[PDB]
Ligand binder design. Structure first.
Ligand SMILES: CC(=O)c1ccc(-c2cccc(NC(=O)CCc3cccc4c3[B-](O)(O)OC4)c2)cc1
Ligand SMILES: [Cl-]
Ligand SMILES: [Cl-]
Ligand SMILES: [Fe+3]
Ligand SMILES: [Fe+3]
Length: 433
């Protein structure tokens, strides 16, 4: 392949290798290796939310961490940076690590909360902070002959899509990205600089997102139904990011419905967000012991997939009463309670091992801010990369996305894009002249 940035006799070709260590045909523990002309790069370093202990890590044992020159972190979600203190403090890694300023500012407070609710300690987290360098958007940095820069990804505050250039070959990694304007976030940029290779998430496959006004209306109607029948409504969220969008939606709906003004809405969290929202109907809640659990009410609590913590405790307190209900707004990863209850089980198991009947209502209305097929198709068509590598999607979803994208470029005489869906540990190899 001739790099796009370029009849003369070609010299020898160089091989570029891409290998997922996590998020290959799965969602969770994003960690993708790039190898080219003696440079080695790691893209993201996450944990899997539906696995435990060392099982939740990417397959780092397949590389020599001392050989990695550069580690780029796309955004603050834990399936992209949750393994980072372990990688920085507990391996032979001695390379350079970058994230955007906002990502690092949130990451420090976020993983400390994660530890206090094991791969590493608070000491590991604080001792690894200085090993992380920051980068502004739209600025080139250079490490070991690798040039890189980032574009806005949408999705959450600070989220980046990294473009990488080595010896004239350019690769764009989306991280997680969204092309839908939020109430507080801009949409992801579409680079004018065209990459040879695109590594892109596959979270929603060939699904098309419901219109935002319709999802907001269904979300508000569901909450309204729950509190109107005397129920407590649980909204599990990751501590920061999408939660701020949901709170703005609810606060606006409450202001427009005076018959709801005596019903409280609690945001149970644990602030530079606004540095980088003064609600009229929402109250801050510090812990379960600070909460008068009076019905009816709305409580937005972490974690988003209810694996443990306050959202799990409230779920177990509330699940046996049909008046109550839970509204799940995130992507539900395999192995989590939030995913498990999608099958409508008759009973659930508490953290303490007791069986309880599941009578509260369960509704799924996604606001997870990922790309859908229409957004992903448009993005790829604007860039026309000769090679597209799908990551970060469940196996069936990713296989359908691959098949649909291949069908889009069969009769195209300008370019015949190749689409790859590697399993974890499987290499994609590409030769450049
Ligand atoms: C034991 C316990 O208490 C606990 C265990 C694991 C976690 C944990 C781990 C990974 C991801 C997450 N959750 C997030 O990072 C929030 C964003 C999220 C969540 C689910 C799926 C996806 C994303 B996405 O936007 O980035 O892409 C796919 C949570 C949190 C708490
Ligand atoms: Cl070179
Ligand atoms: Cl191999
Ligand atoms: Fe994310
Ligand atoms: Fe993700």
């Amino acid at each position: 392949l001739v790099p796009r940035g370029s009849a003369i006799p070609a010299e020898e070709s160089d091989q570029l290798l891409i290998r997922p260590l996590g998020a290959g045909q799965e969602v969770g523990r994003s960690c993708i290796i790039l190898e080219f002309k003696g440079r080695k790069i790691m893209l993201d370093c996450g944990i899997h939310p539906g696995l435990e202990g060392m099982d939740a890590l990417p397959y780092i044992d397949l590389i020599d961490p001392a050989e990695i020159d550069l580690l780029l972190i796309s955004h603050f979600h834990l399936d992209h940076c949750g393994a980072l203190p372990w990688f920085l403090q507990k391996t032979s890694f001695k390379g350079r690590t970058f994230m955007t300023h906002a990502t690092k500012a949130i990451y420090r407070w976020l993983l400390s909360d994660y530890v206090k609710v094991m791969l590493y300690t608070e000491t590991d987290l604080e001792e690894s902070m200085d090993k992380i360098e920051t980068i502004n958007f739209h600025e080139v940095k250079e490490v070991a002959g690798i040039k890189f820069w980032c574009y806005h990804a949408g999705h959450v505050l600070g989220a980046a899509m990294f473009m990488i250039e080595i010896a004239g070959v350019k690769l764009l990694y989306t991280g997680d990205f969204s092309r839908q304007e939020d109430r507080h976030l801009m949409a992801a940029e579409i680079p004018n600089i065209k990459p040879d290779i695109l590594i892109i998430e596959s979270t929603y496959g060939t699904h098309i997102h419901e219109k935002r006004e319709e999802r907001e209306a269904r979300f508000c109607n569901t909450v309204h139904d729950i509190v109107n029948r005397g129920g407590r409504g649980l909204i599990p969220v990751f501590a920061l990011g999408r939660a701020q969008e949901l709170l703005l939606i609810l606060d606006e709906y409450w202001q427009n419905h005076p018959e709801l003004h005596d019903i409280p809405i609690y945001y149970a969290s644990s602030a530079v967000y606004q540095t980088y929202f003064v609600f009229k109907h929402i109250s801050n809640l510090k812990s379960m012991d600070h909460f008068d659990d009076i019905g009816p009410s709305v409580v937005m609590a972490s974690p988003g997939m209810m694996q443990s913590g306050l959202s799990r405790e409230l779920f177990e307190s509330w699940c046996t009463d049909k008046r109550n209900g839970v509204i799940i707004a995130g992507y539900c990863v395999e192995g989590t309670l939030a995913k498990h209850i999608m099958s409508e089980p008759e009973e659930i198991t508490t953290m303490s091992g007791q069986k309880l009947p599941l009578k509260m209502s369960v509704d799924y209305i996604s606001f997870s801010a990922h790309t859908d097929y229409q957004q992903t198709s448009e993005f790829i068509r604007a860039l026309k990369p000769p090679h597209v590598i799908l990551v970060h999607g469940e196996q069936n979803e990713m296989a359908r996305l691959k098949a649909a994208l291949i069908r889009e470029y069969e009769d195209n005489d300008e370019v015949h894009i190749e689409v790859h869906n590697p399993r974890n540990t499987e290499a994609v190899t590409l030769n450049f002249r």
